[PDB]
């Protein structure tokens with residue numbers, strides 16, 4: 185249970201995406217997080233990880249290959265996930281939701297400005313430092329959507345169905361940025377209502393159909409105050425070229441509303 189200087193002291197998370205361990209240097213005591221994969225894909229991931237330098241995105245410290253097992257050393261977010269701050273059926277107080285949303289948007293503006301799309305934004309991947317600062321984590325699905333100032337459209341299916349934008353189920357090719365925006369709106373919904381509005385955004389999904397018919401007397405929308413709900417009406421728009429952009433989210437009334 186050791187890699188060079190570091191003792192791998194406990195299991196922080198697991199999955200087909202390897203596992204994540206708490207790592208404590210015996211010399212220096214600096215604690216970090218290490219992702220361990222039993223090993224194309226990771227080469228890309230590491231590459232993306234090395235571009236990342238922003239306070240709302242998990243830092244990459246470096247990596248080590250040891251035969252089959254790659255170790256990736258990353259910022260430790262000692263407050264865990266946003267998922268665990270969401271109370272089922274209630275959400276969280278609106279001012280915390282707002283602050284987290286602000287921080288999410290800063291993170292996403294940054295990724296997009298370096299031409300990176302995350303592609304799987306959801307509360308499980310939004311981690312908290314010890315002062316409750318939100319960090320966007322897990323770049324195993326991320327990719328480059330802008331290079332030498334030329335945009336490339338995406339075609340791969342990536343994501344988690346309740347968070348995924350409807351164009352991804354319906355279009356041969358799609359712009360990257362409105363996909364991540366959509367998912368941020370699902371996150372905001374989850375934060376304010378403690379429940380996901382649909383299993384996936386298709387027309388065979390009744391709850392999705394009801395939203396498009398504006399039945400906001402139903403759950404989860406009935407739990408959400410009118411100011412953030414109006415912003416949700418701009419984000420969760422089925423046509424991705426009519427959907428609100430981040431610069432325009434920044435001008436939204438609820439976004440700029442002072443709160444407790």
Ligand SMILES: COc1cc(C(=O)N2CCC(N3CCN(C)CC3)CC2)ccc1Nc1ncc2c(n1)N(C)c1ccccc1C(=O)N2C
Pocket residue numbers: 194195196197198204206217218219242258259260261262263264265308309311321322
């Ligand atoms: C000390 O920091 C963390 C604490 C917790 C957390 O509250 N728990 C609760 C108790 C849990 N169990 C211990 C074992 N026991 C049998 C059951 C209970 C261990 C983890 C969760 C995450 C923590 N920090 C952390 N930072 C960066 C990550 C990352 N996670 N992982 C797991 C990621 C998760 C999702 C997406 C990306 C990451 C990640 O890449 N990093 C770097």
